Design an enzyme around this catalytic site. Sequence first.
Site, PDB file in Angstrom:
ATOM      1  N   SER A 106       0.821  -1.208   0.000  1.00  0.00           N
ATOM      2  CA  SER A 106       0.000   0.000   0.000  1.00  0.00           C
ATOM      3  C   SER A 106       0.870   1.281   0.000  1.00  0.00           C
ATOM      4  O   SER A 106       1.864   1.355   0.703  1.00  0.00           O
ATOM      5  CB  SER A 106      -0.924   0.005   1.225  1.00  0.00           C
ATOM      6  OG  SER A 106      -1.621   1.247   1.353  1.00  0.00           O
ATOM      7  N   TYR A 130      -1.104   5.483  -5.080  1.00  0.00           N
ATOM      8  CA  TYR A 130      -2.163   6.488  -5.172  1.00  0.00           C
ATOM      9  C   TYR A 130      -1.553   7.741  -5.789  1.00  0.00           C
ATOM     10  O   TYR A 130      -0.424   8.137  -5.425  1.00  0.00           O
ATOM     11  CB  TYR A 130      -2.709   6.847  -3.779  1.00  0.00           C
ATOM     12  CG  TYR A 130      -3.721   5.868  -3.222  1.00  0.00           C
ATOM     13  CD1 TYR A 130      -4.965   5.705  -3.833  1.00  0.00           C
ATOM     14  CD2 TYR A 130      -3.450   5.147  -2.058  1.00  0.00           C
ATOM     15  CE1 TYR A 130      -5.886   4.813  -3.331  1.00  0.00           C
ATOM     16  CE2 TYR A 130      -4.371   4.247  -1.533  1.00  0.00           C
ATOM     17  CZ  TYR A 130      -5.599   4.099  -2.175  1.00  0.00           C
ATOM     18  OH  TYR A 130      -6.541   3.216  -1.696  1.00  0.00           O
ATOM     19  N   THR A 156      -4.031   2.549  -8.356  1.00  0.00           N
ATOM     20  CA  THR A 156      -5.429   2.490  -7.916  1.00  0.00           C
ATOM     21  C   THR A 156      -6.218   3.624  -8.562  1.00  0.00           C
ATOM     22  O   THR A 156      -5.851   4.803  -8.452  1.00  0.00           O
ATOM     23  CB  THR A 156      -5.540   2.502  -6.376  1.00  0.00           C
ATOM     24  OG1 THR A 156      -4.821   1.380  -5.855  1.00  0.00           O
ATOM     25  CG2 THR A 156      -7.025   2.459  -5.899  1.00  0.00           C
ATOM     26  N   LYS A 234      -5.669  -0.823 -11.253  1.00  0.00           N
ATOM     27  CA  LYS A 234      -6.379  -1.485 -10.160  1.00  0.00           C
ATOM     28  C   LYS A 234      -7.680  -0.750  -9.823  1.00  0.00           C
ATOM     29  O   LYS A 234      -7.671   0.413  -9.442  1.00  0.00           O
ATOM     30  CB  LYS A 234      -5.436  -1.622  -8.932  1.00  0.00           C
ATOM     31  CG  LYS A 234      -6.122  -1.991  -7.614  1.00  0.00           C
ATOM     32  CD  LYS A 234      -5.070  -2.156  -6.481  1.00  0.00           C
ATOM     33  CE  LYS A 234      -5.672  -2.717  -5.129  1.00  0.00           C
ATOM     34  NZ  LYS A 234      -6.743  -1.857  -4.557  1.00  0.00           N
ATOM     35  N   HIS A 258     -12.252  -2.589  -4.724  1.00  0.00           N
ATOM     36  CA  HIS A 258     -11.542  -2.043  -3.554  1.00  0.00           C
ATOM     37  C   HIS A 258     -12.107  -2.752  -2.294  1.00  0.00           C
ATOM     38  O   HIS A 258     -12.323  -2.109  -1.263  1.00  0.00           O
ATOM     39  CB  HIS A 258     -11.786  -0.517  -3.467  1.00  0.00           C
ATOM     40  CG  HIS A 258     -10.674   0.260  -2.819  1.00  0.00           C
ATOM     41  ND1 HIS A 258      -9.956   1.227  -3.496  1.00  0.00           N
ATOM     42  CD2 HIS A 258     -10.168   0.230  -1.561  1.00  0.00           C
ATOM     43  CE1 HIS A 258      -9.093   1.796  -2.672  1.00  0.00           C
ATOM     44  NE2 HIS A 258      -9.198   1.212  -1.488  1.00  0.00           N
TER      45      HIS A 258
HETATM   46  C1  LIG Z   1      -8.271  -2.777   5.512  1.00  0.00           C
HETATM   47  C2  LIG Z   1      -8.148  -2.538   3.999  1.00  0.00           C
HETATM   48  C3  LIG Z   1      -7.272  -1.537   3.586  1.00  0.00           C
HETATM   49  C4  LIG Z   1      -7.113  -1.287   2.214  1.00  0.00           C
HETATM   50  N1  LIG Z   1      -6.179  -0.339   1.804  1.00  0.00           N
HETATM   51  C5  LIG Z   1      -5.907  -0.211   0.433  1.00  0.00           C
HETATM   52  C6  LIG Z   1      -4.879   0.628   0.021  1.00  0.00           C
HETATM   53  O1  LIG Z   1      -4.185   1.211   0.843  1.00  0.00           O
HETATM   54  N2  LIG Z   1      -4.628   0.821  -1.328  1.00  0.00           N
HETATM   55  C7  LIG Z   1      -5.418   0.172  -2.266  1.00  0.00           C
HETATM   56  O2  LIG Z   1      -5.216   0.335  -3.455  1.00  0.00           O
HETATM   57  N3  LIG Z   1      -6.437  -0.686  -1.865  1.00  0.00           N
HETATM   58  C8  LIG Z   1      -6.696  -0.875  -0.513  1.00  0.00           C
HETATM   59  N4  LIG Z   1      -7.682  -1.766  -0.125  1.00  0.00           N
HETATM   60  C9  LIG Z   1      -8.373  -2.622  -1.120  1.00  0.00           C
HETATM   61  C10 LIG Z   1      -7.536  -3.917  -1.380  1.00  0.00           C
HETATM   62  O3  LIG Z   1      -6.345  -3.688  -2.139  1.00  0.00           O
HETATM   63  C11 LIG Z   1      -8.307  -5.044  -2.083  1.00  0.00           C
HETATM   64  O4  LIG Z   1      -8.897  -4.543  -3.327  1.00  0.00           O
HETATM   65  C12 LIG Z   1      -9.385  -5.681  -1.199  1.00  0.00           C
HETATM   66  O5  LIG Z   1      -8.931  -5.833   0.154  1.00  0.00           O
HETATM   67  C13 LIG Z   1      -9.825  -7.036  -1.808  1.00  0.00           C
HETATM   68  O6  LIG Z   1     -10.951  -7.590  -1.120  1.00  0.00           O
HETATM   69  P1  LIG Z   1     -10.715  -8.599   0.084  1.00  0.00           P
HETATM   70  O7  LIG Z   1     -10.372  -7.723   1.359  1.00  0.00           O
HETATM   71  O8  LIG Z   1     -12.132  -9.194   0.199  1.00  0.00           O
HETATM   72  O9  LIG Z   1      -9.655  -9.623  -0.139  1.00  0.00           O
HETATM   73  C14 LIG Z   1      -7.855  -2.002   1.259  1.00  0.00           C
HETATM   74  C15 LIG Z   1      -8.734  -2.999   1.687  1.00  0.00           C
HETATM   75  C16 LIG Z   1      -8.896  -3.265   3.038  1.00  0.00           C
HETATM   76  C17 LIG Z   1      -9.883  -4.383   3.401  1.00  0.00           C
END
Ligand SMILES: Cc1cc2nc3c(=O)[nH]c(=O)nc-3n(C[C@H](O)[C@H](O)[C@H](O)COP(=O)(O)O)c2cc1C
Lengths: 360, 360, 360, 360
Positions: A106, A130, A156, A234, A258
Amino acid sequence: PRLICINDYEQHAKSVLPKSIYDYYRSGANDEETLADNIAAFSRWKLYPRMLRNVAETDLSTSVLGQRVSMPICVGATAMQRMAHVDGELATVRACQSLGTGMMLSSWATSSIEEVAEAGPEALRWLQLYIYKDREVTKKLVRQAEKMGYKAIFVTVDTPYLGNRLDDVRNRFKLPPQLRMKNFETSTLSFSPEENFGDDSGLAAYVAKAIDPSISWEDIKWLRRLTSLPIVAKGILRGDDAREAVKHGLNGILVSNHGARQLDGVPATIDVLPEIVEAVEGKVEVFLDGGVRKGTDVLKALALGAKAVFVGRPIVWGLAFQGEKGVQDVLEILKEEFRLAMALSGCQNVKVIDKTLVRK
Amino acid sequence: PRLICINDYEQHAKSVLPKSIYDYYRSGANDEETLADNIAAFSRWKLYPRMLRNVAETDLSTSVLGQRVSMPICVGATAMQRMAHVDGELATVRACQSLGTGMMLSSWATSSIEEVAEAGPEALRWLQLYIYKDREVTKKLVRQAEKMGYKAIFVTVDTPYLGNRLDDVRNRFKLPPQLRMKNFETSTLSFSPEENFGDDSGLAAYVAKAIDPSISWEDIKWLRRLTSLPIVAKGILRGDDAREAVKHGLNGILVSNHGARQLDGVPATIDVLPEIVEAVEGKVEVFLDGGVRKGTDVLKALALGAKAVFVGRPIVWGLAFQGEKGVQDVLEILKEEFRLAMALSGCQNVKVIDKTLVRK
Amino acid sequence: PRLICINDYEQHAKSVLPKSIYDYYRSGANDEETLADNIAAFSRWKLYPRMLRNVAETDLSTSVLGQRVSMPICVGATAMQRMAHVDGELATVRACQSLGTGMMLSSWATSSIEEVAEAGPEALRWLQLYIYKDREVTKKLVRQAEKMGYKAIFVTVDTPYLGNRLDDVRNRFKLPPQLRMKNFETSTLSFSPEENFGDDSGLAAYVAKAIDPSISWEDIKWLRRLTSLPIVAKGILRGDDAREAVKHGLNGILVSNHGARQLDGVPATIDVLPEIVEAVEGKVEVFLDGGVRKGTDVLKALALGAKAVFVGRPIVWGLAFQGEKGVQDVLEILKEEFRLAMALSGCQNVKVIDKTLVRK
Amino acid sequence: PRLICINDYEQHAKSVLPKSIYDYYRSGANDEETLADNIAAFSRWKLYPRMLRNVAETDLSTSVLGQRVSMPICVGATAMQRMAHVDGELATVRACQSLGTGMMLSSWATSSIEEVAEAGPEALRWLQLYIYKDREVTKKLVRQAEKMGYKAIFVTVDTPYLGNRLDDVRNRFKLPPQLRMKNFETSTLSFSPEENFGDDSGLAAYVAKAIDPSISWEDIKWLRRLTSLPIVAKGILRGDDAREAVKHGLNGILVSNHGARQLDGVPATIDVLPEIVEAVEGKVEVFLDGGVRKGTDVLKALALGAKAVFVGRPIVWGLAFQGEKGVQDVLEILKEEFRLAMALSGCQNVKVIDKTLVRK
Ligand SMILES: Cc1cc2nc3c(=O)[nH]c(=O)nc-3n(C[C@H](O)[C@H](O)[C@H](O)COP(=O)(O)O)c2cc1C
Ligand SMILES: Cc1cc2nc3c(=O)[nH]c(=O)nc-3n(C[C@H](O)[C@H](O)[C@H](O)COP(=O)(O)O)c2cc1C
Ligand SMILES: Cc1cc2nc3c(=O)[nH]c(=O)nc-3n(C[C@H](O)[C@H](O)[C@H](O)COP(=O)(O)O)c2cc1C
Ligand SMILES: Cc1cc2nc3c(=O)[nH]c(=O)nc-3n(C[C@H](O)[C@H](O)[C@H](O)COP(=O)(O)O)c2cc1C
């Protein structure tokens, strides 16, 4: 406690994490319709296994963007992992190195790009980027990723503003006092909990201050000129946007909502995957994330044309249980469930996982 | 209490309103199948957001019947608002004036047409008209609306008799002692709680005494000759009736099932919207109400061809929380959710909200 | 207690009837899939009301087999009504006489054909016939019906054996001591609770002893030669059987699954109605029963081509509440709900209730 | 306790069996999606009964692979039946002999092939075969079956590895101390609870040690040359595999998902049955198991082209209630429910159970 499947890990996490942290990790946007659907949708896709195929020697290995991985199951970007366990991202990358799979880091990590490269030097590592209003900040992140041996940029594209996560608003979510977003060098950009981020979700306020809502395809053009690293879009959910990413010289699409945390009421990622695979015409690898919990989830995404899947929340629950070892456990559970799902469906390796294996 | 979404407002309202008043406000007809569906149906329509569209400057403004509004989200007619808060309709119109949106005033308001125009002189205001057996009463209402700067007549066409709302029957619903339907000058027509309105729902008895069940297209003809104000047919559910409204020189259709309070087992309004938009052939603006609770609901109705939506119950819950300020809060929540829904779906303004954004 | 809809009546009945009697009345066959579906299916058929049709003067009257009725809502055969109230069938026929609608009298009534004709001489009355192994018994029933001014025979064709009603088996269902099936002149045929009817459901054993499982179309031929009264085939679920009934000179079809008490997993009657109406080609009246609880249920069946509907269980719950008055209440509630459903859907009379009013 | 349907038997079993044994018997794989579906799917298939067919003399008899049976309802292989009752497989075969139906004997039985033949010499008996890594073990089982008057081999083809049954993992499932898999002559192959079978499910470890994951169509070729007994492929879910079984000179297909205990998220067997029947083109008998609980389940499978069905779990619950008598009870309940389902649907015998009887 004895935890034998991914759901077990979430349950334990809820018992040991402070409410506001668990809620931050668990939440989807608004009424969480897509959050439920990300999981439900996998159950609607039914498997049609072949028998008597000789599955004594199942090979789970594949490649992502030309880099070999031990399984088509990789770690997705999840911000601020040190809230879950003291070692956060460092634990995560060490587990990935052990497993022989990749970690997508991230931009909002509680550990620096450099710290993570030091903790997992041999691990396959990618940077999730980002686009900051400050393009010099953005450029620095990319240049650091290149310097520190990261193999791709996952840009993203679904977050011009933060999704509305109701629990975060209620809890007035913010970083614990001892923690920062360690890629940045100012109080605001590092998301200091001592900073004024309004009276609602601290993270929503942070995004509004720091992240550029004007992000366009022109910015993709800028990014594509900025780095020769592979770039994956993404957060794409439409075939037309998918084709546009390909036209822009991007090297992959991560079909993602996301983790249902942005726009609520979008379809489950497994449901849109086929339209995207079809749109791309084999020109670029297509990945999926969102609701992957079981080996059969991985099997279904591959059957529908995904090269590999990413896991978000399961990793954070691994961390909450036992940091590095917890993450390794979660990844090993997914690996084993996937192996068994492959074997029972008559698949010796990932190359033979075909579309006739699934029907909606 | 901290209330951050529309559902929060309903919950608080239930805690502070007397049962018979809450029940009057909440209820649908009979088994309330359509009441549940008005909301469920929105969840079945899935969103397909575009990414990378530049949404730094989201413009929510639009127009209703040639009059500019700040957002495509307006206040629908809900009778007897003073039951919810001492200021009732006066609070409501003041909130609308602040927001820069329109208020549709019930013929069964607990405040007069004149009182409402005085409290919100600059607010966009329309009159919701019921056709009384007494046409002179009806005419007076229309003439008063014209005199007092109201910009359109929403003629309700789905209420020849009142729907059967089970709770109202049980509670023997009636106005609190200190309140009247303030547009009228007799004990019966003003719905005096000191009047004989039978042993069941007082409102059902009131309608049976006062409202004309013989209402036909001939009466629409009469209305269309009576006033040069724009006229919207409110309560249409069929494309053939929609075409008939257009033939009669009406200026709009409000696709409505009266918040599921009339005939139960009719479809959700979001579900019939497309048939109606198609029937009308761009000849007249089409609006929707029924089950609008979230910004994404507004986005979906517009994607499906509605010019604007109206909100009924959310406004009453705003009133129950804090009168004018409560209504303003509810409207601002809807506005912000809508802005975010727009931004995350790649829509800079309402003109670019197209049908490819949704799929059932 | 104040009871304002049909469901209220069932609830009260459960509170005042002994378990084995309530269970006998409520039960469907086996897992009761069809019992749930009879009701659910009505909810899936959505209404598309016309507005502005002039509904000041709604006329609910119609005819069944050439006999005028006040509404297209009639009383279906339900065995052993004296278990619900001391007056049983006599109360029922008196309520029907008051309402101006018809009563279909069970062959397994706790009151005789003659007793019922005496209590409701002016009431429209039909006999529901079961074909007994003893054809002289069967003939006697028919001849008595003719003598006593009954206007049709509803021959039940879905009961060669009794359905398996689990509760009846558990409770070892039998008549209360003071009661008999009053059409018969022996201990067995009158279902005497002092008689040996095995260790399971007394009624299942009674059917096995008394009712002819060999019943064929030849027996229909015999019946059609036996009486010149109109004959309706009750319990048809297939279009081919419907056509066969017509070929045999029968005068009607009652589309019925015996209130889901015979074969479980058959479709809801509202769902098969259209196939049957289509099969019959206007040659014979088609009726429906099974799950009718509300005015809108009646509207939907008529929209789909049924001439009239019959109600089973609601009548028994009326009886349980207050015998004759309870039945009258239930019928009046259905009548009023139907009137309102008609009015709100733009229907002045039953002749204008057309297929465009509904969609599945 | 009085138990009158199959579900009653499961409930009683849960009350009297130790947790780990009940859990072993009840469980499906992983989240148990297919386990629920095996049952739900039967409910989606609706019955269209014919009336007036003369069902006084219902004949339930049929044949399986040329051998006459009293009903198209047979006993499927369920491992380790002595956990449920001291007499286990011996009780089961005695009940089958009484009923005039067939027993399919598990390779993992707690009674030997010879013991079972001695206890039910006149009973129709088949051997369910697992292909052991040790082909001499495998051959011995087949030769013993031939010697001991078994009439067919059901080769299980869906178990290269054991499914992941979560409860078994949690309970560390193993045989009770006094029991063995009695077909084998070593501590490992007999599944001795005193043996090292890891820290998870003892049975999963046993399969990994003993059962050959390399099993291919070549092994089917070997089996087909090894014995002239009829051979049925058990566990086929795809039409292409079905055609392959036929090409290999196999004499039948048992459409099975191993009672939802192998790969989770495969369709219900009733749902895939039609594709398989169509694929086979009448060349070989097709059987079904998975979720058969009621007479109407049997009727539906036959209507869809299955020759006979097998029951797994119901038999084990019979055993848990009262060993031989319990099994006889369960079989008699199924027989009677089937008879009634036949009668009420207008079917005199199994030959007239046609496809028009069902619709999804
Ligand atoms: C706690 C959490 C924090 C996340 N932070 C980011 C992030 O910092 N950058 C990003 O591109 N996506 C972020 N996401 C989305 C994830 O990259 C990913 O698309 C998502 O977790 C996939 O679904 P899943 O949690 O059911 O496996 C985050 C998701 C969660 C659950
Ligand atoms: C408490 C309440 C009172 C209402 N009174 C009126 C009215 O006086 N005149 C009218 O035309 N519609 C009336 N309606 C229907 C609304 O105008 C509108 O169609 C409905 O509230 C939209 O659904 P919603 O409540 O889910 O937003 C009323 C609705 C409610 C909930
Ligand atoms: C308690 C009860 C007793 C019944 N007895 C008879 C009967 O004696 N003869 C008959 O033909 N049908 C009988 N039926 C079936 C009804 O005539 C009718 O088809 C059914 O009640 C319609 O469904 P409903 O109860 O949902 O209105 C009975 C039904 C019930 C519920
Ligand atoms: C407790 C249990 C043990 C089983 N053991 C075997 C076995 O040893 N060999 C085999 O081929 N199938 C085995 N199966 C699968 C069954 O043969 C059959 O496919 C399944 O039980 C059918 O589903 P049902 O239990 O819903 O009737 C087993 C199933 C259960 C429930």
